[PDB]
Each structure stands twice: as structure tokens, then as C-alpha cells.
Design a protein around this ligand. Structure first.
Ligand SMILES: [Mg+2]
Ligand SMILES: [Mg+2]
Ligand SMILES: [Mg+2]
Ligand SMILES: [Mg+2]
Ligand SMILES: [Mg+2]
Ligand SMILES: [Mg+2]
Ligand SMILES: [Mg+2]
Ligand SMILES: [Mg+2]
Ligand SMILES: [Mg+2]
Ligand SMILES: [Mg+2]
Length: 190
RNA sequence: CUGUCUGAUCAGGCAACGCCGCGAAGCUACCAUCUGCUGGAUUAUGGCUGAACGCCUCUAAGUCAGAAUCCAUGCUAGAACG
């Protein structure tokens, strides 16, 4: 239909300074800085004031309009990543074989080392992404805490850990073992 | 070793390689021995963030892993007008 104009309004909290130049967003907050390139989308930005930014698509068709609120949401996730952080909690689910999860360091790199998953002799290693912190929860038994400023990196590490512990050649309705994301929140509770 | 021929011996010739045992060298046999590499990108699929569609959603923009697949690495030839 070629909608003449579609708009979205970013909301910038008090301590945050968004910074956009040629579709390269640099969001700065108390918790650090996050950057994102949006050069694959045709959008324009207008600073209404220090607390609002207009995101506009001119003469966009259905899909190009659809790509507008996703731009808004990505920048909003950047904003809330540098002011509240992100925290994904993973629970260790096993029927018989305890899952032995350690945070090891080999070759100067951090790894999450899963052992004894379903009794297997194989040792699973998941590389920890830059800017992402892993921790074995003390307050909860069999819990892994994935935290960081970037929601994408945090959720992708959580997904890596969950996906590497898939059950093969069994009825997965019966063999429910694995490591699953149980809580998706923020570092700073609200 | 047989037959025959050189008078015998010694030493030999022939039997349309005379026949037999062993037989080096060379060739050769899963009938012998040795050797047959590790990276990236993907398919199906399972996912992340995420709109459309105030929710949801692996998908639309973007993105992760991933097959005996593919492209390299490696291996053979080297364009007889590179
Ligand atoms: Mg099956
Ligand atoms: Mg079975
Ligand atoms: Mg004669
Ligand atoms: Mg004759
Ligand atoms: Mg012989
Ligand atoms: Mg062999
Ligand atoms: Mg999701
Ligand atoms: Mg796919
Ligand atoms: Mg796509
Ligand atoms: Mg030549």
C-alpha cells in the first residue's frame, strides 16, 4: 500500500545518551556502552528532545514498515542493557545423572564445561561470549546465571548452553534432561 | 638322470630349451609389507533477538549451531600460443 509515513518514538532515560550517526547507534549508560549497526535498513532518525528520538520510514511497503518497530525494539534493548543489564537463569534438569557444570579457563578463554550429561563420557565446552558473565548460583541448587549488558549476547550464550545439551536417539518427552532458561530478567531488579 | 654319438677316460654334442632337484637376480601376490590430511561454508533441522499483528512467533530485517554435502587444504597433470 506504500504507507506515506510511519513513526516510532524512543524513550531515553535520564542517565542514558543515545548517539546515532549514519545508522550506527551508540548507547551510553551507567553500565557501559553498546553499539549497533543498522545499515541494512532504510530508516531516518530525528531527535525530538533529550528524552525522545523519532524513528521514521518514508513511503515504506508492508515489510519495510515491519522493519521499523524492530529497529525501535533493538535500540530499546540497547538502552535497557546499559542501565539495567540482562540476566538469564538456567536450571539443570536431570532424572538420574547429575550434570556437572564448571566455569573453566583454557588458552586464556572462558568456557562453560558440561560433564556427565546423561552419563556420557563426552565433555561439552561452550565458549563464553565477550561481555557475558557466567556464574554458578549459590542461592539455588543446579542453577547457572548468564548476565551481561547485551541481550543478544546473553540470550545467545544461554541458547548455546541449552542447545549443546540435546538428547539424541531417545524419547525427549521421557528423557527431559538438559539445561533450560528458566528466567529472563534484568540484573537490576525492577 | 635316460637314450645315443665323439675308440675308452676326461670333457662334451644332440633329444624342434630332453627330463628332474635346488636356484640367486629381476619381476611379482590382501599369497607379502607400507601409507591414505584438516579447515571453512552450508542442507534438513533445532535455535537467538524480533516485528508484521500493542500478544505470539527461528524470519520478515538481522543472527547461532549444524550432514557421508559443497569449496578449499592436501594430492595428480601443468596451459606444448599463461
Ligand atoms: Mg529420531
Ligand atoms: Mg529407541
Ligand atoms: Mg648331429
Ligand atoms: Mg628330430
Ligand atoms: Mg622354486
Ligand atoms: Mg590400512
Ligand atoms: Mg524468543
Ligand atoms: Mg533456517
Ligand atoms: Mg532471513
Ligand atoms: Mg608450459
Amino acid at each position: 500500500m506504500k504507507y506515506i509515513q510511519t513513526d516510532q518514538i524512543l524513550d531515553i532515560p535520564e542517565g542514558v545518551t543515545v548517539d546515532i550517526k549514519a545508522r550506527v547507534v551508540k548507547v551510553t549508560g551507567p553500565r557501559g556502552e553498546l553499539t549497533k549497526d543498522l545499515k541494512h535498513i532504510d530508516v531516518t532518525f530525528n531527535k525530538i528532545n533529550n528524552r525522545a528520538i523519532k524513528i521514521t520510514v518514508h513511503n515504506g511497503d508492508r515489510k519495510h514498515v515491519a522493519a521499523l518497530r524492530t529497529v525501535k525494539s533493538l535500540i530499546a534493548n540497547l538502552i535497557t542493557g546499559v542501565t539495567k543489564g540482562y540476566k538469564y537463569k538456567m536450571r539443570f534438569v536431570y532424572a538420574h545423572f547429575p550434570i556437572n557444570v564448571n566455569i573453566i579457563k583454557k588458552d586464556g578463554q572462558d568456557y562453560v564445561e558440561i560433564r556427565n550429561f546423561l552419563g556420557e563420557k563426552r565433555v561439552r565446552e561452550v565458549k563464553i561470549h565477550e561481555g557475558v558473565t557466567m556464574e554458578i548460583s549459590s542461592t539455588q541448587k543446579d542453577e547457572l546465571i548468564v548476565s551481561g549488558n547485551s541481550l543478544e549476547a546473553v540470550s545467545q550464550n544461554a541458547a548455546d548452553i541449552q542447545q549443546i545439551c540435546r538428547v539424541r536417539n531417545k524419547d525427549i518427552r521421557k528423557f527431559l534432561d538438559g539445561i533450560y532458561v528458566s528466567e529472563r530478567g534484568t540484573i537490576v531488579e525492577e
